[PDB]
């Protein structure tokens, strides 16, 4: 499914991402926008054997099991296919682990390059949450 900006913001807020670990909602919307263009079925197959799955492009070496990646850790304890549904619940739950377990939103390359230092609140301006 391809989310609308405000639609995704409302769903993320209902899943408790606003101010999660000090990151306002807009950061999460901005990251989804540049990671996947709000596409829940996005997949990026990397040359290292790993694959990035879903709206937040979670990588299979560390976070989910797809049965095909060397040195997989499966730290979210989920099959990577659960990250490919229209329901964002699994990606959100795993994204929380990632910012947690690891260290901030720098984990997402698109956030680091396209959201960091910008007015992220603009991604939720106009929306009714």
104: left (phi over 0), alpha (psi -120 to 50) or beta: left
The one catalytic residue in 35, 48, 87, 119 is: 35
The one catalytic residue in 7, 48, 52, 119 is: 52
Neighbours of 55 (CB within 10 A): 30
Q: By the 8 A CB rule, do 94 and 76 touch?
A: yes
Catalytic site residue 7? no
Read off the DSSP letter of residue 49. S
119 is in an annotated binding site: no
Catalytic site residue 48? no
How many whole angstroms separate alpha carbon 36 and alpha carbon 56? 7
Query: CB-based burial of residue 45 (10 Å sphere; 0-12 exposed, 13-18 middle, 19+ buried)?
Result: exposed
Q: What are the binding residues for substrate?
A: 101
Q: What are the binding residues?
A: 101
Catalytic residues: 35, 52
């Amino acid at each position: 499914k391809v989310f609308g900006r405000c639609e995704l913001a409302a769903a993320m807020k209902r899943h408790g991402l606003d101010n999660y670990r000090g990151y306002s909602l807009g950061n999460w919307v901005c990251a989804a926008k540049f990671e996947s263009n709000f596409n829940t079925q996005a997949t990026n197959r990397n040359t290292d054997g790993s694959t990035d799955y879903g709206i937040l492009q979670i990588n299979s070496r560390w976070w989910c099991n797809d049965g095909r990646t060397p040195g997989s850790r499966n730290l979210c304890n989920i099959p990577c296919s659960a990250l490919l549904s229209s329901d964002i619940t699994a990606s959100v739950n795993c994204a929380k682990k990632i910012v947690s377990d690891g260290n901030g939103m720098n984990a997402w390359v698109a956030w680091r390059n396209r959201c960091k230092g910008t007015d992220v609140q603009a991604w939720i301006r106009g929306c009714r949450l």
